[PDB]
């Protein structure tokens, strides 16, 4: 087949959003659309680094 493995630490969703829930924001407002790709996982948050990781840390 041919299909691109994202890392682990991403997930492959047919919708998602170029703004995900982060440490700043837990739900920014955006005019986005559903966006085909690899995103963080359910549950894992930008932090206030500049990375995914569990909301814990925020």
């Given at each position: 087949?041919?299909?691109?493995?994202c890392p682990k630490?991403?997930?492959?969703?047919?919708?998602?959003s170029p703004?995900?829930?982060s440490c700043?924001?837990?739900t920014?407002?955006?005019t986005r659309e559903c966006k085909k790709g690899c995103f963080?996982?359910?549950g894992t948050v930008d932090n206030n680094h500049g990375k995914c990781v569990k909301k814990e840390n925020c």
């Open positions: 087949g041919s299909m691109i493995r630490d991403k997930i492959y969703k047919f919708c998602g703004c995900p829930p700043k924001d837990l920014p407002n955006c963080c996982r359910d």
